Design a protein around this ligand. Structure first.
Ligand SMILES: CCC[C@H](N)C(=O)O
Ligand SMILES: CCC[C@H](N)C(=O)O
Ligand SMILES: CCC[C@H](N)C(=O)O
Ligand SMILES: [Cl-]
Ligand SMILES: [Cl-]
Ligand SMILES: [Cl-]
Ligand SMILES: [Cl-]
Ligand SMILES: [Cl-]
Ligand SMILES: [Cl-]
Lengths: 334, 335, 333
């Protein structure tokens, strides 16, 4: 497997087989154990990595940096300003220049087309740290986390529901991943925000080969029944207009993950997941503005759920690093 | 070493969180690490550690000190600047703390209310170091006391007399007063009464000082405040984050507390040394300093160029010592 | 030259002799070989470098970072905001503080006077990563690249033309460098944008000693006749007001490097160079806005040229790193 991943880009899970994805998750677990044991071998010694961010990030950027450092690599962070990218230099040119100096490149930003163009022109591995359409490294971490908290199930045995805006990058990626791994995923939200028809048809085609199931529904009780995990994300994503809150809060509010939703699973051990950052109280400037305008306290999840014993969001966040490390080691390591 | 043991895994949020002997230990360790770097004998005690540096205010010395100290000790760093991350607009400090705590071995924070750094320190689960808040600037004062010891030819801190002039209730004034009380020093806070430190903080420091033999004097009178001082210290009259409307109201109030050569002469001490945490407004070579001094027809604000560039000024030794003392804090808490 | 380069600042090519510049070029080639062979020895192990940027950068910043990393050094990037520089703290004070903590300092920004002040006060080597007036590290990379693509010619044997805005940092530095190395350079552009007369005079004096030739001309046909390389750069530089485009497109467009200009060289082996970033199509926001407004496809260079077999811009861009490495190794190693 390892050999088959060296020099690969990591642009989207549609580009990877079931067994490649399982391999990456297994490698993540091995690297995690090694870091905890003090026995990590540095497979990226002497390698230099460029991290391009055109959107804000805490987890993803930090995960890249720490993963690189632990593995012996050095990093250059190219933030939303300070470089020539976009205003003064094309992505084809930036890809070719960075490919001359760096051993691998991460990109977070806007359209998937941009990352694909980087991936085609750079000549070194390119990794997608989030695009408007997909967020592949997040789902690797999510699946590692589900396996850790399931105590001996395979992925193909796990049932989970994603609530809210199912057509954002995280919803898209969860559906693709669930299909690839034979899981039972429910997307529970307003029909206007279900994923793109062609993406759903592609994933259903995949799911019929892997034994996976994909349910779209507006009905919370039906969607969440028997779930091991409940997942949600912000209702308006980076780059979108705040006028979207006016269009969406009324449609999404029934899909807020609150204690009643956990109770509707019927599963006393239900675990709550969120990719983060989350709006669960008034301790952010945006969350407070939205909550005040619409008369809410927490948006996609309440404080009571987010801070409960059912919440595994910080384990999930940690696993961003271990899984990003696995991607870099598989694609760039010795 | 008992001090070393009790310091492992601690935050460094404020000097009020450390004993007199712990603070002495950190100063002593700083001197050892300084000697080691100069001799080429420094051992890397932070090999494989990763540190996150959160900055919500600008910085040259503190940022650079944390980076170089980490680098020298074998650690790697992530700088998380005023924007580019999810902090504050999209993610709470409690959440940020817990996430960073999962990935990094230690975290620096520079920013606004002390309450924020305290929250980060409670929630992170790894050492959190305060690189400046509105209320306190603890790493600065470690550097200052190492510098005073290096320039005092064998005197202990408990033997040193010093005055801080100007805005005595800013972070550095607050911290100098706590540090002086801890270490048994004689400190005079010299400034307008409205800018004296909070009465509750003064009372806490007077209690600390009674057991160490320290002395705390608050006065508006410069000549009585500086008599006999080994060191004179000042800082800008308007601090980061305060409204810049304050310059109009404060320059004329604070101008009597400018450190100039007459003030040095009022000490009556030919060996007097001048200290400033930096950055300093001492001429027309900054945009802000030039605009505010020109408004009053002044050449320099809190300190003159004549004092700042004199043989009495030890500000660049003090600046260098920011690195060696931040190194001690990180080695003690994570080494 | 080894003894002579240790602890030096690298503020402008005017400060270096012909032999020192050739030594840096030769060292860059040796370091490039070592990285490609996997034999690179770390001569900056344990050194810490500060990188101050008051203007944007992709190549220069990345070059300094990768060069340092490869050589065992660590770096602090101090970007256009986040520090106390300028508004709160003087450059004399900044220099002195950074000199206490770091082993070397890079500066990219505005007036050359600022970098000179930093180099006078820091007490450690200071390197100019671009100023309004000069861009010395670029020209090292450019001359390394010419030597690689000239089939055994020496620099003193090479003829080249720079087209467009001759008084920008890159035009200035190419003229200085051409003078130092005995080259035949033509600066080809509108006379309002020819380099300062005092700098031209200084370069002519240098050229008299080295056998170099410096020509200023508005004539493209004559200017490019026989050249081995054609070089251009954007018509409006960082820190200039965007209103400059309206003045300069009409004056500069006859100096666009297009396939007809390459043809006018009479040289089937002519190669095209550009410091980058370049406006050669509509795939940047500034480039698209300006070109669309003026009915053009590409500004200083066309796509047809830039993506042609004659274009060596990515080799040149790579060479930014190997040449910055040499500057650091020579001055701090
Ligand atoms: C990690 C952030 C994911 C969110 N859907 C967004 O794109 O903002
Ligand atoms: C190091 C800066 C200290 C100053 N009192 C401020 O807070 O701006
Ligand atoms: C490397 C950029 C060169 C250009 N003359 C500028 O100053 O913008
Ligand atoms: Cl994906
Ligand atoms: Cl609830
Ligand atoms: Cl304090
Ligand atoms: Cl004076
Ligand atoms: Cl030059
Ligand atoms: Cl053409």
């Amino acid at each position: 497997m390892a050999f088959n991943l060296r020099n690969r880009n990591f642009l989207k899970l549609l580009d990877f087989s079931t067994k490649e994805i399982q391999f990456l998750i297994d490698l993540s677990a091995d690297l995690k154990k090694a870091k905890y044991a003090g026995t990590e071998q540095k497979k990226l010694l002497g390698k230099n990595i460029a991290l391009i961010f055109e959107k804000a990030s805490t987890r993803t950027r930090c995960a890249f940096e720490v993963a690189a450092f632990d593995q012996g690599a050095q990093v250059t962070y190219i933030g939303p300003s300070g470089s020539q990218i976009g205003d003064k230099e094309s992505m084809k040119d930036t890809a070719r220049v960075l490919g001359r100096m760096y051993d691998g490149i991460q990109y977070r930003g806007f359209g998937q087309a941009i990352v694909e163009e980087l991936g085609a022109f750079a000549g070194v591995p390119v990794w997608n740290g989030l695009t408007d359409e997909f967020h592949p490294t997040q789902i690797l971490a999510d699946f590692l986390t589900m396996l850790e908290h399931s105590q001996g199930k395979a992925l193909a045995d796990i049932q989970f529901a994603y609530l809210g805006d199912a057509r954002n990058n995280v919803g898209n990626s969860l559906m693709v991943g669930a299909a690839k791994m034979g899981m039972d995923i429910r997307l529970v939200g307003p029909q206007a925000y279900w994923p793109d028809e062609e993406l759903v048809a592609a994933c259903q085609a995949i799911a019929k080969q892997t034994g996976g199931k994909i349910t779209l529904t507006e009905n919370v009780a039906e969607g969440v029944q028997g779930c091991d995990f409940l997942y949600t994300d912000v209702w308006v994503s980076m780059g979108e207009s705040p006028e979207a809150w006016d269009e969406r809060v009324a449609l999404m509010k029934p899909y807020q993950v609150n204690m009643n939703v956990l109770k509707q699973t019927g599963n006393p051990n239900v675990k709550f997941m969120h990719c983060l950052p989350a709006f669960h109280n008034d301790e952010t400037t945006i969350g407070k503005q939205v909550a005040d305008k619409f008369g809410m306290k927490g948006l996609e999840v309440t404080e009571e759920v987010f801070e409960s014993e059912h919440s595994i969001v910080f384990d999930e966040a940690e696993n961003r690093m271990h899984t990003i490390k696995a991607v870099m080691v598989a694609t760039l390591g010795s």
